[PDB]
Design a protein around this ligand. Sequence first.
Ligand SMILES: [Cl-]
Ligand SMILES: [Cl-]
Ligand SMILES: [Mg+2]
Ligand SMILES: [Mg+2]
Lengths: 117, 241, 225, 111, 250, 231, 195, 52, 204, 243
Amino acid sequence: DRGVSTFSPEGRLFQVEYSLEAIKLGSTAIGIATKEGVVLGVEKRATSPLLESDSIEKIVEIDRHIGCAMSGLTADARSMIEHARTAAVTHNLYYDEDINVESLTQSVCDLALRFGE
Amino acid sequence: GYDRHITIFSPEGRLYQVEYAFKATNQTNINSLAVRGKDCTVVISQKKVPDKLLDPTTVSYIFCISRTIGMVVNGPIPDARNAALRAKAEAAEFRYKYGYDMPCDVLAKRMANLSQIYTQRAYMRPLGVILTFVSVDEELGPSIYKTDPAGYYVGYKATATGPKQQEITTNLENHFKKSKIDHINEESWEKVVEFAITHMIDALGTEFSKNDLEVGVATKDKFFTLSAENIEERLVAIAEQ
Amino acid sequence: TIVGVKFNNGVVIAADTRSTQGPIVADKNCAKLHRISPKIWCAGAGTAADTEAVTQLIGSNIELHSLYTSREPRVVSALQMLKQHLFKYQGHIGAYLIVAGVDPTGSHLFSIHAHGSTDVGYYLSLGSGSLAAMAVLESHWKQDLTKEEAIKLASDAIQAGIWNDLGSGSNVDVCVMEIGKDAEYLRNYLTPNVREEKQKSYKFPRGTTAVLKESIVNICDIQEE
Amino acid sequence: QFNPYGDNGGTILGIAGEDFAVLAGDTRNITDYSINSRYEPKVFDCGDNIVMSANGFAADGDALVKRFKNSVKWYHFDHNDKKLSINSAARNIQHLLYGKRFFPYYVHTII
Amino acid sequence: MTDRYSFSLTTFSPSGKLGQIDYALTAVKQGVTSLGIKATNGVVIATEKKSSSPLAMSETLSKVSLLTPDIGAVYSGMGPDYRVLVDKSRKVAHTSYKRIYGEYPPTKLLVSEVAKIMQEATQSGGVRPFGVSLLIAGHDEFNGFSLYQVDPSGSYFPWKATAIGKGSVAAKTFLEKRWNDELELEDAIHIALLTLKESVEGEFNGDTIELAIIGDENPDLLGYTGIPTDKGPRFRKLTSQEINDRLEAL
Amino acid sequence: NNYDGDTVTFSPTGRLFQVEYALEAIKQGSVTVGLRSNTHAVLVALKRNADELSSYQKKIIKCDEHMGLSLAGLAPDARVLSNYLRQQCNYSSLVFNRKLAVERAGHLLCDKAQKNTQSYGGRPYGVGLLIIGYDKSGAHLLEFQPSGNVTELYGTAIGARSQGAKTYLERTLDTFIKIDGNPDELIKAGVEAISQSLRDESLTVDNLSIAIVGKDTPFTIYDGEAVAKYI
Amino acid sequence: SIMAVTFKDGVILGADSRTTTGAYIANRVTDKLTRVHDKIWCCRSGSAADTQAIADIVQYHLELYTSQYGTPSTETAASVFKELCYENKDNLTAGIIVAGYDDKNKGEVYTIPLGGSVHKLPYAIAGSGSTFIYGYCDKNFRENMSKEETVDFIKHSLSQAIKWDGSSGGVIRMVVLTAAGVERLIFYPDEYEQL
Amino acid sequence: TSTLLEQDTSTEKLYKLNDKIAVAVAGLTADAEILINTARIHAQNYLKTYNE
Amino acid sequence: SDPSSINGGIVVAMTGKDCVAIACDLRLGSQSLGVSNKFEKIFHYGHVFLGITGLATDVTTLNEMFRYKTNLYKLKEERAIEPETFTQLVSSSLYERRFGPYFVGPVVAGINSKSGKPFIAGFDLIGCIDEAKDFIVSGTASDQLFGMCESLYEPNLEPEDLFETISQALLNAADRDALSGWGAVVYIIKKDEVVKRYLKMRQD
Amino acid sequence: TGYDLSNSVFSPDGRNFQVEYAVKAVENGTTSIGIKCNDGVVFAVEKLITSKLLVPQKNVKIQVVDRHIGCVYSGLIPDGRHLVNRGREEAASFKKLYKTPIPIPAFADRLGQYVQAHTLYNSVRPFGVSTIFGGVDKNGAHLYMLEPSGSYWGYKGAATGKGRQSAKAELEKLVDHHPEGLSAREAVKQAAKIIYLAHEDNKEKDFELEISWCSLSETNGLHKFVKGDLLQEAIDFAQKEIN
Ligand SMILES: [Cl-]
Ligand SMILES: [Cl-]
Ligand SMILES: [Mg+2]
Ligand SMILES: [Mg+2]
């Protein structure tokens, strides 16, 4: 077939560009930052009226000071949330403080390109 | 048609990568010959130095594997040296484990088994070389055993390898049909080399200077190669009768 | 007591037939002479399990080597393979062996100690009875021994061990390996220690022993019909 | 047998004021009854207004101080040059020390 | 580097064929003829020594191989593939049996082990099947004399008599007419020589034919005396002269 | 074409297409300039925003007190390579009490990039780096390509429209090399250089990113109102 | 008692022939002079098993060296011995003297004590019996001695070592290494005891 | 089959797994024997663990 | 502390005319304390009988192990294992734990089904083989059994005579050992019948 | 067809096309040469000045192995650095076991076997460099050249890269006109000339000359770079010969 880590002639990773298409099909998520706080909102999008909507969990707590909304293949997010929670708690264990929002984000993004053969 | 790229069977029950490896064997355009005396085994090979910038002393396809075993290769030098280093390693390991010098026919079998694996395992390619092992074995006496990329090996009364092998083979066949013996009935190795060079000249129809040939001799308890001046003395003796 | 004696056209090895656990005689007719290959035999002393295991393993690998090379096995091969194995285990495999045999190279006699050391000799002895055996060998050995002389010397050296060593006893086992001949294994070559008739028959009258219960034991498989 | 520990002596003293702190140590390094040096510092500036001393076996103290200095460097790298607070430094050093719980650093640490 | 071929190279095709096994069987068909016949008091295996060059010493190439003192093997197909199988077969007889039970394996179980090695080259990653069919003749105390065929697939079957390779179809028809359950070993050798003559083109003598028997114990080939229970190998390779003697009464 | 499926395949003209595709990711990246005198070495980077609500992607990464780089291409690949430099700089300090030479930092990046171009399953790095540093032989500027090729230069630029800045520096070579013991003037020359690569957009307060290292100057990054002086 | 002495024409290796377990002489005709190459020999002292195991590996390493790079130097042989002895110091009891003849370097002697350290010396002594002849050898050794002089020096030296050491005894074996080739000498008790 | 196949010593279809369980095979005999030996071992593992 | 004398117990085997006998005590203890008088030490795999003395956890483990191995043998070979072959399997199995051995004293008894030849063997804990013509002994009262057998035994005893000899050898040896007794079992083994008898003996 | 898509695949010819494509990368590279003199070897290379912004004398191409072996290469520069890194490991392991610095023929086969190994599997790519290397050992001076296939021989003179044909012709003249041999200082002068003459194939951009040598008499059998006055004397001689 072709490598999973292959570059396109335009200098973009095929598999990354394709995943971005999967995210476009996902339910909407919005975030707004203010000086009084940050708001996170999601569309639940139940596939049937018999589906108990309150079981649809697309907004998730990472730590007391960090929330998270998701869009796309939401099952893929479970291990990313797991890593984020582990990073936030592990940092609090090692340094007796709350981890910076940028550092937590950077930690999650380090998983992203760990794919190949 | 990926059955021609790796070593899996074709519908005809053939391994094409093995067949193409046999073709690589003649890429050097060099012919080798091996004969047996009473007390010795002689191997002669054509030497070609096409570039004046080359150091002719480093251009060789004959290898001293152990003190007793010599190996001439028909094929490209990278694969020749790959096979040489492995045979040298295997010969040394054998002596350490089993406490006696690896026989010529046993090293042949081992290198042939390694070759067989490259024909059965996909990730490894065959080596594009034919290996001719010579020695005076302490049990079997003068010995010639030859390996190929199929992993085939057999003993030989005499043998020839390279583009013009069939011409040399028939020349040797005809001599042994007259004499009705499995060797050259000669005391000295000097005269057995003279026989080897003479029968190569007759078979290829070409004359040789001292720099055109490359000679390896196996006696009891050592294998050695001749210098240009040692070959010159051999060429003078042939011309003077 | 195990000895090896080189002779004109071959090598002979002999051993006693006693194995002991502490001061108790476990086996009155033990076999200390082992076939590594048809014409390569060795005698073992030390841990009985160790000498049997180490001769069987090397004997197996020697047989595979012989088949691979199409050559009769050499003593130097069995020797080399034994010493490298024993050395690996730093003497924890307590195998002390006298390795003899004839091959295309000629006749050979070696001894191997449990730490992985070997030595060459015309006469060797090993085990608790080695000093008794070596005393006879050092007294009666000469260069250019005949076959008959070498068997006599070897068995005499074992007798010295049987009589004067508490760890040695019972019978003398010999194996002669002559160049260009079949190795002859002479099991119980001498029987110097045969027990005498007892004074009494201790055969009991039937019904002497009190039996609580009796039952048939089913050794047959599940039956048909 | 080989003994992996030694005693290089010396004494360190830490006092905390209302708006300041001091860490002091003698500059004497000894083994047995000999003097190794009369001036070999034992109190170090580790950056971010943190001073550290590991007193006991000098080899273990030098190693620990190095690891903490390295630890401060990587805090800046991984946390956008955030100043390392004394409480955070203290918790980090606990994890450094406990790492060798079954082959300890033979030192008494004050920061 | 690393062997990055961790996947099967033998797969099922839509028709339910395993291509590489079929192609292996095709390689065997191109191979020189070999046969085996079972008598009441022995087994015979035979094949042609197809010499690649007259300068080549054909004695140095052994097509009929001793596996154990009571078990022999002959093949049709790729020689190198046979040589490495004989090495693995000899070793597995020791590692999986003789080093455990202290006796050589019975014919059917050694066959079972060779069959297993060939099945694995049919499913394991980054390998092709073996391009040989084996005929394995043997004796053991409880099963008596037996003859087995092993194919590239790893499948094996017991035979009263059979043939593999170039002229197998003709050979098998010839054997069906001659074979009865009252054959002596000499009768089976005579039939083996008659059958093999049909598939050979050129010279037919002791120097061009390779023949071995599983028969009576050979104490003269044991190499030592003294142990009554050890009576010597039942496998014997016939000499050049011994074959020529039986070609005069042919 | 048929020879771009993976990095282990040469083309019939002896080209490695996967490497050449990786080289393309850099050209798509935002412009960054590097230049040095005998005393100081300067990085200037144009940061790129997603939209008006978004921040401007950081371009400059500190590797040690005496060394750091600017990136153009895949940011995650710059993070992996900068982390490796941080470690190698750190190893040199701890083991040998030695600040890693800029030239030897280049040699190490080269050899790390190369392994990803000769082995199956892996991919080349999709980023180009400009490494500045001050070591025992003075100021240094390096250009890294994910082919493995590393080059020591007086000045250079990588990313989109980089050719404009590179030509300016090629003219100004004799001027800006002589700017010794004047950091502000060397940055001015760097800001004037990157200006030759701008179109439509101009240098704003949250757009411009500058870094400097020199004789008595640790590697420091300037962002926000700290670069308003140079606009 | 083992020694190696460098003279004008090359080097000579001397050793006694005794192997012991406690006070029992396991072998009274031991060959402690062993070949690792045609003109590179070693003297073995310490554990019989350890020295035999090490000598076997070095012979293997030099046979493989010769195959690839031609005849190795005495320095190269010493280095391989050192590497095995140093890296496995915790598990080895081996004291080895390495002696060899080149045509370029002529006679050379290297000694490897327990640590696995290497020392190049004009001559060397080792073994339990060596301690009794330190005084004698230091007073009697000259550089560039003849063959006859060097044989006498070793014969007299080991004669004394055997006399005072229970662990030394049997015959005096010697191996001469010159351009001329390899000569084996043996000297019996009746000869060397009356010196 | 053939007339020259030794039937009384032949097995391709019916195999014993233990004294209570047998299998009939349909497919590659070699492939079946790999699985049959695995099953025979599991049966003896269970018996060794539970004594049933 | 010594693993081979924590639990205690004995086994003895003898050969007769066209028969063999193997016998054991029934005691299992924690040193001085007697726990069970139903701990039989003789197991059979077809017509091959194995007695095991020593650490009781290893007696049970090796029984389960040899049942396992002889079951696989019978499925592959399509015949019951013979005494001579089983002896080699016991030896093999013990020596593979050379440097971590089972603390046991195994004894093999049985008649070769083809040759009809009576066979007995004994082993040390690492699997050395003692193949005696007359008798084999094992356990905490091995010294006592060696004494009894060496005086009581004569060759070519008939089955009903051999029973009396081996029974009197076990009973009198066990009564001179603190860690042996609490009942006894005797197996008389002929080519195609095996009788098992429990002996009345002192329970102290 | 498809025989050229995967490394280690034999074509019906018995050729490895992936290796032959690697040779194209080499032919594309700058010119590098080696000259074997009376008691040593000289190495020289062409460095293309892409821009004025390149710092003169800073981007060094010639690499030392141990202290006695010089290495220069044409093609993919990173692939050359990777091969020299392996050479430095091989030379280190040899010296560690055998004490003596690795002989040149012995070092040649270490690179040879490693490069050949990258033609055995399709999981790797062949080396995109031809490497000219050598120095002084106990048996005297040795010059070697190594191709992507793993092929190497000894040479009186060697050349590779875009200007190899021009260089080879100039080397062949020196071999004929000096049968008795060439001195180390003469070989430096001649090396300069041959690079300047071989620059006609890369005449678009101006270049920087870089020379190194190992001589028994001139450098005590150690690898050194030609610097200052001796480099300027060679540039002057070269400039005089083209005019
Ligand atoms: Cl093999
Ligand atoms: Cl010794
Ligand atoms: Mg392949
Ligand atoms: Mg004394």
